[model samples]
Target: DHRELIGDYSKAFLLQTVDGKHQDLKYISPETMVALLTGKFSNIVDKFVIVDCRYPYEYEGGHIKTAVNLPLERDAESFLLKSPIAPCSLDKRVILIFHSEFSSERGPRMCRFIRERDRAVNDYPSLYYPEMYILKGGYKEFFPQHPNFCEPQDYRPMNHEAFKDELKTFRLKTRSWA
Candidate 1:
């Protein structure tokens, strides 16, 4: 079933194999992200989507170009089913690369949630986003390595006390999602 959809998901996405396990939520280096943007590879110019899982203020302050603001489970779920990507994404591999301030919590959290959700909603071997990526060290690490690539060349943390009000609001939302 997946073969028909993506001929070869692993090959197309350069999916890595490690520890004899599934690397669905793979971690990619900032240098590799540079390659993606610099066209080191072909056929992926429009296939990949970068997701910023940090708060809106953090994202709005600055983020990678074309990065969508998907700070919660609901945002990720809807992105999978239809966020202007599914209806026309018939045979193409729709890639997802997620990142928060750091690769520690939010990025991986959202990645894991969406993959399972994708599996739950689709029939056998028809996952909406079969593989996902967590930017190693996340935006915190990436911004330094590729400063010019980010949209306003800025980074904001969700845990910073500066946005006490915003943090409180989002924390409540996250807890409700739980």
Candidate 2:
């Protein structure tokens, strides 16, 4: 049977969130969330796209680097029911990470809706079910560790041009950065 993914508005999962406010949903932590994001679902993150389901103000306040901001106010449960982004070939990796200082609980729900629909393509399709991953404790759980995380390097770009070529490929070679 399809697992009842949507938690009750008052389930322990919902209450677990320390945030006093939520859009009536629950979320998973960031470290664990990223592991799943880059694991069995690795290609998915690199193939599809990422979205930010937090409010406009929250999104402006900062997000998971490259996530596209899509604010919600009308229908939380069915907002993405027919997203134009869906129905396309998900052959490419698209990782959407949602967060909100005020309403983060809804992130997983959004991910779930997309993964559950008829968009995912290619082998092991069902494994790409609409994912609803939350950003742990919202921005509260992100800011501290996020700064140290730099943007993914451009492997191909660095391989071109004059000065770019001289940038050098030195590894940490030393036991420590002393």
Q: Give me the runs in candidate 1 sitting further than 4 Å from their true place.
A: 1-24, 83-92, 175-178
Predictions in order: lDDT: 0.71, 0.42
lDDT of 2 by residue, 45-90 (tens): 4432335555444455456555555544223323444443442444
TM-score of each: 0.80, 0.42
TM-score attained by model 2: 0.42
Q: What clash count does candidate 1 reach? A: 0
Which lDDT tens digits does candidate 1 get at residues 23-98?
A: 4446778877777777664464346778889998889877998788988788678776664354243544566788
- Assess the local accuracy of residue 138 in candidate 1 as a C-alpha lDDT between 0 and 100: 78
Model 2, residue 8: distance off in Å is 20
The reply for model 2, stretches above 4 Å from the true place, is 1-26, 33-41, 44-50, 73-96, 102-129, 148-178
Pairs of residues clashing in candidate 1: none
Clashes of each: 0, 18
Q: For model 1, what is the C-alpha lDDT against the true structure? A: 0.71
